[PDB]
DNA sequence: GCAGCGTCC
DNA sequence: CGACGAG
DNA sequence: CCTCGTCGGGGACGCTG
């Protein structure tokens, strides 16, 4: 089946006095929370650096314990890159080198990939900045669907996605994946509210498997507290935002349930990205989302 | 007409 | 979002 | 030991003078 999980923040999950092993400690509590509510988490997402500063956060003892934690529970963990990881920026010599550090760190601790945000630029400039990166065996760079309004390239329609990854394949750049953030393609103007709306988009995705195979596809399962076409990114819990709140009564006619079926049939990783002000709010929200997910799964 | 910000990811 | 200091 | 203020080597958004 699918590998379902959530983003694990340091502030809302780590114990006080976690000292040198705060990321692994947070994941430990996050795995405990999964067993309590009867949804064994198979995936997770963390920041090993930043995300707003070009500094590595994870420390040595954390790197050793994180590898043991990942192996023990067999977790599919992905690292989200910092917001400064723009390899196609003008002065990007300092930027690309920092991404090289993260990719090396990911392989040391057994993290499966690194998420980078696509820019609102041409695919030629995208592949150019990507070529400046030497691959790291076992770590996939997942290019995430961005969100904007006024720019030509949003990488949310299958035409723009197919164009990008074919230029990737012609350049012969290995270890590149796709991260589909549902809240972002919605913000970029892709109606995925109904089952058919998502099914048509997801069918066009499978129709270009020869350029981006589902083995290199991961998902951010996020509802959006914004209008379709906003360019503005406001995450919300599943069936509690503008995309799927109208389908809370019949969740198997929503667009999300079609995403769950594709994630299931391809064993893709799926990460919920929820931010709330405090631990208990976040846990109440995720318990609702993962029990609903368990309904669509089991 | 444009340059500089503040806010959010 | 997370490290780091003030208190 | 704590809590809380601060501030980021990018960028999209909308706003302001
Ligand atoms: Zn992201
Ligand atoms: Zn995302
Ligand atoms: Zn987002």
Numbering used by the authors: -1 to 40, 41A, 42 to 296
Report text from the authors:
ASFV AP endonuclease (AsfvAP) catalyzes DNA cleavage reaction at the abasic site and is a key enzyme of ASFV base excision repair (BER) system.
Per asymmetric unit contains two AsfvAP/DNA-1 complexes, and each complex is formed by one AsfvAP protein and one DNA-1 molecule. In addition, the Zn2+ ions also forms direct coordination with the 5′-phosphate group of dRP, the product of the abasic site cleavage. Taken together, these observations demonstrated the catalytic activity of AsfvAP and indicated that the AsfvAP/DNA-1 complex was assembled in a catalytic form. The AsfvAP/DNA-1 complex structure was refined at atomic resolution (2.35 Å), which revealed the detailed basis for target DNA recognition by AsfvAP. The DNA molecule mainly interacts with AsfvAP in three regions: R1, R2, and R3. As revealed by our AsfvAP/DNA-1 complex, the S-S bond was formed between Cys16 and Cys20 within the R1 region.
